[PDB]
Design a protein around this ligand. Structure first.
Ligand SMILES: Nc1ncnc2c1ncn2[C@@H]1O[C@H](COP(=O)(O)OP(=O)(O)OP(=O)(O)O)[C@@H](O)[C@H]1O
Ligand SMILES: Nc1ncnc2c1ncn2[C@@H]1O[C@H](COP(=O)(O)OP(=O)(O)OP(=O)(O)O)[C@@H](O)[C@H]1O
Ligand SMILES: NS(=O)(=O)c1cc2c(cc1Cl)NCNS2(=O)=O
Lengths: 373, 898
């Protein structure tokens, strides 16, 4: 039995080497950063909901610290984790690596995990709920994980839940049918279509097939009808079957004074308080702490920070009771956006909700097409 | 303030232009910034009514409507006739639902049915179906024009104006009509549409004429022929069947009717001339099917409710009192057909007269015009469909010569060459003038096309790729499968030999296309299905519980660029193919760490090179500062679930003497890391080296002849040292090689004299033809070779005889490769064993195809890396044949065996 299963698996995996890649056949192959899969069952459940027998799903665990690999204990624990995953009826592969820190292990997994064409192209990581009351080095490493994911051409998906992800198996929200609630999609920027593909595949399961999908797109106050018509036409060309389209004409409006003050206080303990010197003469103080923010950087990114804090209000007043909130994840340029600022943006976009909030971002490459080549 | 969202950022908002590959009406096609830009530092068109509904409706309507349907309803009755019509309609409607679903997924271009099938199912089946469809349409035009010519000949003969003879008149009339049709079609699609609309109007007028005639009271002529206007008695009597003649069977009527009304793809074959095909094809096709079905049912019922089955046709057969004995209902209206019924010799009535529908109608010439219009419309539709489908097929370039056709022309790329080819084929088949033995073949070709359409829909639905998002959601994959299966069953039930011919042609064309390996990548359910199968079986393997009963040698071959060292890949693939996983690992030193599109292109090129050598392996490339780190990454993460490597295959670095010692340090470190990861190590050495920098040849690609494979088993590693040569010896290139095992089985393991070696060899079922014992290992080697070894190791000596163990590492802090005097004196006997074993190997295995030796192991810290490399060098040196130094994982590989 095992021999025959291995033979079939190997034959088909090798045969897949001959098949060429096409946009019509694009599949989201997810590398889920779960650690021990029983610690964060919400991530596993959510990813397996839309990945089940549709695309590759890998649960990545990084064993921090130095060790001479091998040993029978590593295999025993890997077998235990695989058994736990199988008991939950989750079609996923468990993969663990040994590295000095989380960033190195994630890099190893993103570089080597997979088999031929069956290799991940999306990174799914949980939100760092405790990023403020923690050593800034950890925050820098987390943002560096995101940066490495982008550097490898991966699509990034950040999952946030109100109570966090770290906890007979545990039961999560994604094991129960959502019902008539709505999946709210905020397609603010063109990333290729990942922001839409993930919710579309999610709604193709029986647990989310009853949810009404709402798409929110930015626009102009004097061209709302035209923008709505154009976006509806685009969605119909994609044949995604999304119900409602809303246009937000006030994303550039200045946010309330209380919320901007809250955002300012959030990054207060990361202010390097040195933004009156040349960038050349400001990296000396960052040599040991490459996470502080310089007043020049804050002055340049003020508009983007305000846009983040205002998008939070827009989401709060629209998606208060949705079953899922999908927001396009903003991109911060390397070297011009300190890890603290990126973390603050991610915290500000998703807050004060009851969030199954997903921040998605494709690699700027089309994953949808209205063509049959 | 209140300006356009996105005016103050590099990121762009979603717009249609970012996804279109067409020509931008305004300026050029805008392109969204690449991820590195944001990241990183520093022509007439037709509507659905005139384009699809009219065309499909005219295609479905044929001559059976006027000349056969009344006969079928007379023979089988109204109920059985409705059953036949409904069965045909279920088949056709399932096919239409499938085509509608397949036709709403992206934007469809010119190519009609062939385009949809090929783009949804792959070039393999698509090309064969396209060729068959084009040929079938080119012959259907001839069949329809022959029907029209036969009708014209019958009319002329009835009028007494024949030209030459019944057979030749058909030839002349058909040739002239087909020429006129060709002229009409070459004038453009506007004139073709005008002609289609004219024929539709003529058919509608014919229907109105028949309906009006069926209501007026019956005249003496009509009455004496069975027509009596709607009567409850006639309707009731005409419900049960009344079979007659050699064809009076249900299957006979079904075979007459079904192939006559199935042409539902007429509208979808001009998809390149529609405005919004995704909106017009489904609606038009389904409406056409519904309306044609309604017309068939209504005609059947009305004709069966008005005409009796038998009628003499003579006006003298009126019923009067005194003479004759009336029989049947016909004698209740004052008509006596008793004599005809008794002798069964009357030529009038629903069952005996073939033109009863024309007699009933108020003007027979209108019925004749309706027949003319139906036949000509079918011929024109077939001509246009064949031309368009063939032009698309030739555009795709799946065949070696048909490429000539397909040259579009002014404005609309009209395939004039395709029109000429179709007209030539139609004329050639008309010249025969006899097609009763060819018509079943064409019908079965159309049925094959229907089955392929249905299977395309079903396969796309079952695969469920994320790109399969049809906007028409009123289909069922199970219904599509039933439609395909029933289409094949009907094809075999009608003209089974014709069905065999059609299936054989389809298979031959598919085999040709598959062998030709077309260079088209459209994205099909077949590729998505291949991915589905791979994922499903990998997950199934993962589900199976871990157990030792399925050991396989899963090799991670460090080849760098695969074309650089093809000997390594060839050797590993020899014993890995069809048995276990093989991964070709390539490490890129690289400045920093990134993966741009160029890296993906290079990886695709390497994979293509690997697949062009018929080698079953995965190419994996990683970025690392040095080779050792890349190998660590590969050994840590490479693989998927249970299909992960457990053997490391690396080449011998013959340049270690002349190179920075840090490089040899890192090489030995790679070996030690593989050992520490519970990997099996396998070092390959050749006198010419592995780096050879179409396909380069390699000694492993050739026959080995009678040369012998020599194994020097010096340590019990679990069986890999013997597993590899055994697996190698099962191939057709190593079969003639005689395997010799020089069993120094267990040096420091209490080896048995003769019993244990033979027992283990038998348990390995290796067919070891010879077993030799070489106990002359501890013997001191010749002084010359000892001096050679001393010379090779001299440069790495640290000269630390008087220095202690505690202080030796001090000067080693920056040069850990250097040897220590105490280390030299400790690894002296074990170092001379290497030279002695080299002596033995050199004297025994000098004409062997392959040499396998146990890989020495160097203990970390107390065995300097340079000394380990020296041992490896001395062990395998001066040997012409390839040398493989192996050391198993200490895990029982005997479980691999049956
Ligand atoms: N050892 C690990 N292997 C793989 N992914 C990890 C590992 N540790 C953390 N992660 C990922 O990083 C994310 C953030 O983890 P982090 O610990 O920084 O925040 P947290 O989960 O709020 O804290 P805690 O783990 O103490 O609950 C998690 O969602 C998880 O997906
Ligand atoms: N970039 C690489 N990726 C993977 N393996 C490598 C790479 N470079 C070298 N190797 C492996 O290390 C071995 C020694 O290579 P090295 O360049 O150190 O010596 P060499 O004599 O140049 O080897 P070769 O004769 O194969 O070129 C090779 O047999 C090869 O298998
Ligand atoms: N012209 S067509 O390709 O649409 C077509 C014609 C006929 C069919 C089927 C099709 Cl798809 N079957 C019945 N004989 S037909 O009218 O020539």
């Amino acid at each position: 039995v095992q021999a025959g299963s291995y033979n079939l698996a190997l034959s088909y995996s090798v045969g897949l080497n001959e098949v060429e890649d096409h946009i019509k056949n694009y599949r989201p192959q997810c590398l889920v950063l779960t650690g021990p899969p029983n610690f964060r069952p919400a991530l596993v459940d959510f990813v397996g909901t839309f990945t089940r027998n549709l695309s590759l799903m890998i649960c990545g665990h990084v064993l921090i610290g130095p060790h001479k690999q091998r040993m029978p204990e590593l295999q025993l624990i890997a077998n235990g984790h695989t058994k736990w995953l199988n008991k939950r009826k989750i079609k996923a592969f468990y993969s663990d690596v040994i590295a000095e820190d989380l960033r190195r292990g994630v890099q190893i997994l993103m570089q080597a995990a997979g088999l031929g064409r069956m290799k991940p192209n999306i990174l799914v990581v949980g939100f760092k709920k405790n990023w403020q009351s923690a050593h800034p080095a950890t925050v820098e490493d987390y943002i560096g994980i995101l940066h490495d994911a982008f550097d490898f051409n991966y699509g990034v998906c950040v999952m946030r839940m109100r109570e966090g992800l770290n906890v007979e198996q545990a039961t999560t929200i994604f094991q129960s049918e959502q019902g008539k609630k709505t999946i709210d999609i905020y397609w603010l920027f063109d990333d290729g279509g990942l922001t839409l593909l993930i919710p579309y595949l999610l709604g193709r399961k029986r647990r989310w097939s009853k949810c009404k999908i709402r798409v929110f797109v930015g626009g102009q106050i004097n061209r709302m009808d035209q923008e709505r018509k154009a976006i509806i036409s685009l969605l119909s060309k994609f044949r995604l079957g999304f119900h409602e389209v809303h246009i937000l004409p006030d994303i550039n409006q200045n946010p309330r004074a209380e919320h901007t003050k809250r955002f300012e206080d959030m990054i207060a303990p990361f202010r390097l308080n040195d933004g009156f010197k040349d960038e050349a003469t400001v990296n000396e103080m960052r040599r040991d702490c490459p996470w502080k923010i310089s007043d020049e950087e804050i002055t340049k990114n003020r508009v983007k920070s305000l846009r983040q804090v205002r998008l939070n209000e827009i989401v709060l007043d629209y998606s208060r009771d949705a079953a899922l909130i999908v927001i396009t994840l903003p991109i911060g340029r390397k070297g011009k956006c300190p890890s603290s600022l990126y973390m603050a943006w991610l915290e500000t976009l998703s807050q004060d909700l009851r969030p199954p909030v997903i921040l998605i971002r494709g690699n700027q490459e089309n994953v949808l097409t209205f063509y049959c080549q």
